[PDB]
Ligand binder design. Structure first.
Ligand SMILES: O=c1ccn([C@@H]2O[C@H](COP(=O)(O)O)[C@@H](O)[C@H]2O)c(=O)[nH]1
Ligand SMILES: O=c1ccn([C@@H]2O[C@H](COP(=O)(O)O)[C@@H](O)[C@H]2O)c(=O)[nH]1
Ligand SMILES: O=c1ccn([C@@H]2O[C@H](COP(=O)(O)O)[C@@H](O)[C@H]2O)c(=O)[nH]1
Lengths: 312, 312, 312
């Protein structure tokens, strides 16, 4: 029993292999707490301030549920820019130093990348980054990795297909970053070439020992993977090249025909929300894990709230 | 002591005479709980997810108060369409299967009729329909009927005037539907002809044994009724016929002159919010029951939350 | 131990010197409660309804934190005008008489001055005015005065500089009003002439025994004051006179050069949010009290909630 080594949860680079493993063990303990028919009091007396600068229902409710499942309570806003209705203006550092007097922990979702680290540096209470604009989304990365460990039973020696908009894929990028901290990992980059993964991730994996391989053929890669992590490709990413959007039409979808070629022990993941890139009849298959994945986000966020406030 | 026979609260057709009577008895028990100076713990450890797709303050707070008066806690949103601020799109069934991992019961207010039943079919936790777009609003119907039983002392053998926009009146339609399950009921349809009640309700009552009668003369009908259930008529319902809107001007209002012709034991009901169809000086009369009616909504919604989560 | 002499908290004129002093003593007790590692239950079983007609994050969270630090619970809205999503319209008195059935105390922030007093007159539960449109903001006045007493150690015999837009300054006006209830007070009105304080305050102070003096020279006045209460001047207040806005540019700012001329025992206050009228490097100085000031708002609002619901 000791203090959590992290003062804040901001970026994926904060985590090493052993810290991840320990957090995942705590998440399993949080699942036991959530399953119990007794109300937990671990965080009784603690207040979480949800500081969202835009509405983002799923992830906010996941945090607020985690706090209340542990016996803590919540202050919420999805209008953080509106500091006062009578005097215009808002400054992140002033909001933090004001709200930290009302709460014991801040969960912030800003619109600008880099805001989370500034808030952590300013606040004298722990801060969790719930989505740093277009930047880091660390608890989504943790729950993604945790879901793989939970569903497949291991993180060493697995094969993961990262599908969709990889060039601009916030979560596929951070998922590959955390998976590179484990051994004998193989990652498939499944995409159209114009939204293929960028070199910084490609070069970080190689220099990490991770084997990787690019493809345009999801149906082939699928049969060899433990995990198929799906994300959308927005039509706007193709610009004027509707010939390429017509040539990709139906080639990166997860549907029953794709499930038919996958191992019985592989899973489909999707951070949500989804468009048509996973058909509705996939949901009935036990390998459709994207809703168990969301539930794992509750356990992970319970773990971080607990560790940051009362330690190991 | 046993399980509630309803898995969800969606539509008025789910309820028969005896179920209504039993629910109303539970609502009376909930009133005793709310009146107590001790905090209830009946729903300690349970979380209610308020899934509103549009802001609707009164009815949301009625639900959230009911949960907290019973010792449960709440997750709220009036922006349910905004599943994620970073990835556009929302799908009802995906929202339900995501949020049900954070909560024990869902109270949803969608914008499209039929959404509540789909959510119930998808969710593995109970669902309450708090307003199904232009469709069912069952807890408003229950609290309307409960208010009559509470104020008049009976439901068999009463006379109720349904006033206002009856053709498109969501709540007058469902109120008449539930009242038709009791005996020797008489219903007055008080309206301009162009917003008169529709045949489906007229034919369901007749085939239910309920006696009914249409009128354009509220001042006559009022003196014969136990209940005057008032609703607005929006000027837009008249279209271009401002001659009819001028001919109806002042004819379907509840004012002191109308109270002067009503029995001392009759009541005024209004689901709220009201416009000018009930004058402010009616409020001081003990027969103005529309605020006691709103309070009864708390008791009814306490009862449903309790029954759905812990049974009879 | 007895009943709070105030049924509601609406206007500064409700408070006399002795009531203020007693409230400030309770606020000090509330600070002890907030500091404790035990969850308070003083307001267990009580519900606060936050009825905000516009979003105003800081002050809402200050109230909602105060309630939860005392063990009470909260119903919130920043969309109070949206009584129902299906039927348009909202009437203050109908909202109050509806929501008071769901709660034990109402904290309202309306958009129109005079709304708070109407709500108090209508409600059978206590009401706190959290910002009456352009009108009274009493808890901000209380926390402003309380901050001075807490930081300087006294209210009799002090010198306070009120800086910024004084003509339209909601909080400088009410701060001077409450300070005039103490002895040997001296107030400096530091402003451009076109946003100078108005006669009603100037004449109320004189008739109160308070000495006052107007100035355009913050750097002089600062060295003689116990308190420098800063507020912005919006460029729009100058209208077309950009020559005056250019002549005032840099003359009413709080910066390190101004701190260099102030007593070591003086403080900087600012109700927040601020623009550029306090430079960021002032924050590191122990005399920058605007964030301790916000924290004092929590204690004051805890005190009022406690007194109004359970008395002295
Ligand atoms: O089709 C999709 C759906 C989601 N996401 C990522 O998953 C995150 C889900 O977390 P949140 O936005 O709900 O908090 C999004 O922010 C986004 O970065 C994608 O990349 N593609
Ligand atoms: O003048 C009125 C006021 C309310 N309603 C009905 O009463 C409901 C009140 O419930 P809620 O909208 O507040 O949840 C409305 O949705 C609407 O269907 C009317 O028909 N006419
Ligand atoms: O530069 C400023 C900042 C704030 N205020 C006053 O301080 C109040 C802060 O309280 P609130 O608006 O956050 O509730 C504002 O409403 C406003 O009246 C000013 O006069 N000038």
């Amino acid at each position: 029993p000791h203090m959590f080594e992290l003062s804040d949860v901001i970026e994926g680079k904060q985590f090493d292999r052993e810290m991840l493993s320990a957090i995942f063990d705590v998440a399993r303990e949080m699942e036991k707490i959530e399953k119990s028919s007794s109300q937990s009091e671990i965080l009784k007396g603690y207040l979480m301030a949800t500081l969202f600068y835009e509405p983002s229902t799923r992830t906010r409710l996941s945090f607020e549920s985690a706090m209340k499942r542990l016996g803590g309570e919540v202050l919420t806003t999805e209008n953080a820019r509106e500091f006062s209705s009578a005097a215009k203006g808002e400054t992140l550092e002033d909001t933090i130093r004001t709200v930290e007097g009302y709460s014991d922990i801040i969960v912030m979702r800003h619109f600008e990348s880099g805001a989370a680290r500034k808030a952590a540096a300013t606040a004298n209470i722990p801060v969790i980054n719930a989505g740093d604009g277009p930047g880091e989304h660390p608890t989504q990365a943790l729950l993604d990795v945790y879901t793989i460990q939970s569903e497949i039973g291991k993180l060493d020696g697995i094969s993961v297909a990262l599908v969709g908009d990889l060039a601009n894929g916030r979560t596929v990028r951070s998922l590959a970053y955390l998976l590179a901290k484990f051994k004998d990992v193989k990652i498939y980059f499944v995409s159209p070439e114009i939204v293929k993964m960028k070199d910084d991730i490609k070069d970080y994996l190689t220099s990490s020992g991770v084997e990787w391989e690019e493809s345009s053929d999801l149906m082939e890669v699928a049969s060899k993977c433990d995990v198929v992590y799906q994300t959308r490709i927005q039509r706007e990413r193709f610009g004027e090249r509707l010939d390429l959007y017509e040539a990709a039409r139906g080639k990166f979808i997860v549907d029953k025909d794709l499930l038919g070629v996958m191992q019985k022990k592989a899973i489909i993941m999707h951070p949500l929300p989804r468009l048509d890139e996973i058909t509705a009849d996939v949901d009935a298959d036990p390998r459709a894990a994207y809703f168990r994945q969301a539930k794992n986000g509750l356990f992970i966020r319970m773990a971080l709230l607990k560790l940051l406030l009362v330690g190991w």
